[PDB]
Design a protein around this ligand. Structure first.
Ligand SMILES: [Zn+2]
Ligand SMILES: [Zn+2]
Length: 75
C-alpha cells in the first residue's frame, strides 16, 4: 500500500558566539571573515578576538586571474 506523505522544514538553527569569555546573548549574528565563526557585533571583528587567521594562508603567490573595475567620473 502506497499512499504517500510529505511535510515542511521550519526550525531555527540558532547560532551563538564561539567566544567563551564573551557569554553574550540576544546579539546580531556575524560570521567572522577569518575562522568562519559567527560572533557578536562586539566580537565580529578579527582583532576583537585575536582571530587565529589560519584559514587565509599568509601572503602567497596565486595564479594569473582576471578582474574588472572603473571609476564613476572625474572633475
Ligand atoms: Zn561575542
Ligand atoms: Zn575569526
Amino acid at each position: 500500500g502506497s499512499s504517500g506523505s510529505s511535510g515542511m522544514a521550519e526550525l531555527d538553527i540558532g547560532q551563538h558566539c564561539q567566544v567563551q569569555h564573551c557569554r553574550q546573548r540576544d546579539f546580531l549574528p556575524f560570521v567572522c571573515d577569518g575562522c568562519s565563526g559567527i560572533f557578536c557585533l562586539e566580537h565580529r571583528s578579527k582583532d576583537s578576538h585575536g582571530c587565529s587567521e589560519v584559514n587565509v594562508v599568509k601572503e602567497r603567490p596565486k595564479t594569473d586571474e582576471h578582474k574588472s573595475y572603473s571609476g564613476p567620473s572625474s572633475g
